[PDB]
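Hi L.,

You mentioned the student needs an example of a multi-chain input paired with its predicted structure. This one should do, with 841 residues in total across all chains.
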Amino acid sequence: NAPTLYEKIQQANEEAVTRIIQSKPILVGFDKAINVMPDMTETTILHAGPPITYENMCGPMKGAVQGALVFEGLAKDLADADRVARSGAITFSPCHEHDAVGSMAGVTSPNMYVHIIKNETYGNTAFTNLSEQLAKVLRFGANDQSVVDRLIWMRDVLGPLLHDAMTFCPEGIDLRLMLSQALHMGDECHNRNVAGSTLLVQALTPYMVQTDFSREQLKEVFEFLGSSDYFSGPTWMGAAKCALDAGHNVENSTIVTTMCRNGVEFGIRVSGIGGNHWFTGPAQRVIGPMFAGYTQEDAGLDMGDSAITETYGVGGFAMAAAPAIVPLVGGTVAEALNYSKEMLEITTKENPNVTIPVLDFMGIPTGIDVLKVLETGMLPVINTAIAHKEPGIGMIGAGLTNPPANVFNEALKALVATIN
Amino acid sequence: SNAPTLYEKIQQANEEAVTRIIQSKPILVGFDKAINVMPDMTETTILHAGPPITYENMCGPMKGAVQGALVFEGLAKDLADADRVARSGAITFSPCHEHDAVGSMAGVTSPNMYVHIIKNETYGNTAFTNLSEQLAKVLRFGANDQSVVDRLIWMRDVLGPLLHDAMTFCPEGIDLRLMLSQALHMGDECHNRNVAGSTLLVQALTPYMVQTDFSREQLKEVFEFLGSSDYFSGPTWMGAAKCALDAGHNVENSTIVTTMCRNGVEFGIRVSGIGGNHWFTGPAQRVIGPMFAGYTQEDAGLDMGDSAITETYGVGGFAMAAAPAIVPLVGGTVAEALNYSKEMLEITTKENPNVTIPVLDFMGIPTGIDVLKVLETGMLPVINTAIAHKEPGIGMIGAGLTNPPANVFNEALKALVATIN
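Structure written out for the whole complex:
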């Protein structure tokens, strides 16, 4: 009594999405990437998006890698760094291929500090760097003395104090739970992190104080953390990565387990294909509110791993939860309420642990299924920060984008061919 | 001719009054023992929520409050004794409202409790409120074990002083209208759901507490205390609202409500054009809503507390729409909550642009409940509040929707038509 092919996929997607939903990413500590991540070398630099060579990277990402190389000691300055990167001496590699995710340029170097996030349920581990805090920052390609000065402080004090702080928190911090409180306080955990960041520092505060650091280091670190609302940003991405990784490599699943971009190409991974097989197409423009005297002409293409957030069910998929981002991202609140409802049409089921009050507490729409995106013709709606096409400069606005279509086509083809 | 006519003079006065309210900017500047900073305090003076009320006529839970308080202040050896002292002529019982303060639930506030000191940056008037004790077994609900009096002492021996000291490292103060601003974009409504506000406040306070001379060991238990409940900023918003509202009080000819409060027996309001501490009073009402399991509506007491200053300001139940998280706690439908915040506009003078509700396309909260419009529409202020056991100390046993009583507005109007030169 054999099962039908479409029936295989239904079963696989149920297995896949159950693992995603039942995942309980726990924040366990912090440590230099080199000390704690897989396949790391002192000459490895990780970045956001699918694979790409340095020569092909876009302005901002190059800038971030130059900034990074100088932070590492590997270069006396920017002009030098570019020479060093171009030389074959550096190994470049996506975060995703090292069980990590990076925000924006997503450049992460051996002695940057990272979140250590462990899946309570299924045992896998995810990693992600810390938010610098301002707008003029490495993850946007800026790379002043000021910028590397701040990387240094983070390596030399912030990192160490968080490492020591989690030492006094043997239980870890349950990120799904905190994520779910966040969506009840008007965040979608992608471009709105206000509530999430405030929960995080509340949670971290008493452990920090139990540290050997001085009152004065403590104050300046409290101040950095209240500097902007983006501190938990990376945190939610890591939880999402931890969760989605538990749903990868399931024999016949058509669930998207990764969506990322590097400012030149968008790449996806699908569960039933497994491993690091990427499907890539052109990164799209990001249409939205532009900042202080800026234009669409100035913006680079979509960039960053933050999209792992929508792949989980949050961010743009949860925009109904966060009507407050509308001025920042464009559109009506009407539409913002609608997206979460429409995303039900291309996902596999509601996540009963993360709910949205304005929608009568419906679970977030979880598990993008390539088949449904093809049949409905609805590409996932992503929200994102807009970055300048020039290195240096800052974040310059925010808006809405979609993945390219080709990518889902190519994945559909790969699947129906795998199953025989 | 426009020979300055009447309905005008009211339209003009409401403009000035609501402009004060909207433009007030309440700044949290300090903390200190009531007796050190509040107007007309004496050591034998104790404050309660709602309009004036003798002790003998107070209700179960609030009598328990003056008793716990008295034991703490050290004016009676014990509960049964306390009740004796209160009944003797040796205590002045007067409302928070008449000392520029406000009080949550029983609202009892005695000389040695610590209060927020909140000062109007625009208009320069000050308001005060006590702090959240943080548990369910708590004085504001009438409970008075040893445990409760101990926590009260802890709050005045340690927590209190810590707070006071922290705020001296912060000479700019904390801007409350801004923070409230942000809370309402984070799913709070600053009456029933206070999570966002509370988390924004403990975070702004931390840097300053750390600059203090308290031991780490002491900071440790104070954090434990601050996250034991999400209610820590609740009083803070009452104080904010009280501070703004008072600056809109005493405007000749104005029919704007500047106080709504209750003491478990009566509901009482003040109107700007009437002024001072002239109170209009009716029967406090039942609060009907979902019940905490094992409890039922005949367990409940009548509406009690000063927390309704919140809807007097434009927030709380008036902001219902901003806080879809509360629907199953406070009852009703989400569509109904959107609808109520819209409705409230026919009762109010104009939208506050500085404080807005995202889901309603960022309309400003509805400000300036106008006696005259309450009357002509027939529509009463909606207030969402906690339902509290009628017995002392049992505490919150659910929540729901209530209203002020119709009569209180009728009298208002009649007192107005009799004043307006």
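You could point out the following to them. Chain A touches chain B through 30 residues (CB under 8 Å). The two ends of chain A are 18 Å apart (CA to CA).

Best wishes,
N.
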